[PDB]
Design a protein around this ligand. Structure first.
Ligand SMILES: [Ca+2]
Ligand SMILES: [Ca+2]
Ligand SMILES: [Ca+2]
Ligand SMILES: [Ca+2]
Ligand SMILES: [Ca+2]
Ligand SMILES: [Ca+2]
Ligand SMILES: [Ca+2]
Ligand SMILES: [Ca+2]
Ligand SMILES: [Cl-]
Ligand SMILES: [Cl-]
Ligand SMILES: [Cl-]
Ligand SMILES: [Cl-]
Lengths: 114, 114, 114, 114
């Protein structure tokens, strides 16, 4: 099944934040309406916050997260969760290797902001 | 129901990261072993990271997040999500006012690390 | 925080299913258009499906779950989860007692159908 | 990533319930310690409960859900959610066809019982 694609409410500011847990340097691309809007990268085995940004979901509300290590796409897993019918998280894990820890890059999307 | 309390696997390192979206200065306390292990304070209406750290869940595995503003505890909401039976998120929102956006401090806990 | 209230897409059919795990008879009430639209009752400590029904979220999309045990409202906990940006669950737990298992009546809402 | 595999607490009773929303007869297999423990089959486009059963997670706690239609495995999506650090859901969707509604068989696992 497709993973790492989320329909947000249109024209909405959201936070996107990436964490690294791997020997390899991660690259996280964040697309809004099918165009790259942010790119984060770093290397940490201790959950470094390699990037954080505020983006706008735009007219489509379509947000996609892609993860790669030195040109190789990682395997994604994802889901969305809503607390008290108000607070939204879109969650991505990724695996670059064989251990299936799926934390090699972790991406959290949150809205609303403000 | 109790909110912001999570039983992690014992003796396990975890990330805790806090984001602010409020006029109020947010104070986030993270307890392990029922004693404060990290405290983050900051202000933003743009989802700024007001703290990030790695902590150890200790012998009980019990982790608690508390949030207060102007000395008053905020109302918490939380849940845990597990992706591909491996990647864990414990998520907390909080409300310091009337709009019920529950984003006034947002806390992301994630494990495993490494 | 408010629990057991969910904003579904308007005019959408959804399943609602209740399970019982308690010494006491559970009453589950499901509201749409702020009016009770399905009710289920039963006593089980073996996760009986005390009722399942398909309902329509109507023009507001507002769906509410209430649980009580012989008149006394239970304490609710809830969240919503979305898989592959498509499949939706709204989840309710409830506590009628002191043990905080929150399984005394469990309610699952799922959409889309068909 | 692997989907439909969950590590429950060992030797614990859990509920497993399957719903159908498809033109085809759905077959759901529920494995405990890599051996099929329960199987549900049925057809509905109106979210009928095609099976429900209480099972024991046994010494390993490993539970796996597989879904097929007339011998063809469906594509699975899944996650786990925990409310108030107590109530657990393991959630499965499946897609048997081209529309990607992922509701063709929906499987809900819940614990603890009682
Ligand atoms: Ca890995
Ligand atoms: Ca890793
Ligand atoms: Ca607020
Ligand atoms: Ca706010
Ligand atoms: Ca109880
Ligand atoms: Ca109970
Ligand atoms: Ca389908
Ligand atoms: Ca279908
Ligand atoms: Cl909720
Ligand atoms: Cl999973
Ligand atoms: Cl997803
Ligand atoms: Cl919680």
């Amino acid at each position: 099944a497709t993973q790492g694609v989320f329909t947000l409410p249109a024209n909405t500011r959201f936070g996107v934040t990436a964490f690294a847990n791997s020997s390899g340097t991660q690259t996280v691309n964040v697309l809004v309406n099918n165009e790259t809007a942010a790119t984060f990268s770093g290397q940490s085995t201790n959950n470094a916050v390699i990037g954080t940004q505020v983006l706008n979901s735009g007219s489509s509300g379509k947000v996609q997260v892609q993860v790669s290590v030195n040109g190789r796409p990682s395997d994604l897993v994802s889901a969305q969760v809503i607390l008290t019918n108000e607070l939204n998280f879109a969650l991505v894990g990724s695996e670059d290797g064989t251990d299936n820890d799926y934390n090699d890059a972790v991406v959290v999307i949150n809205w609303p902001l403000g």
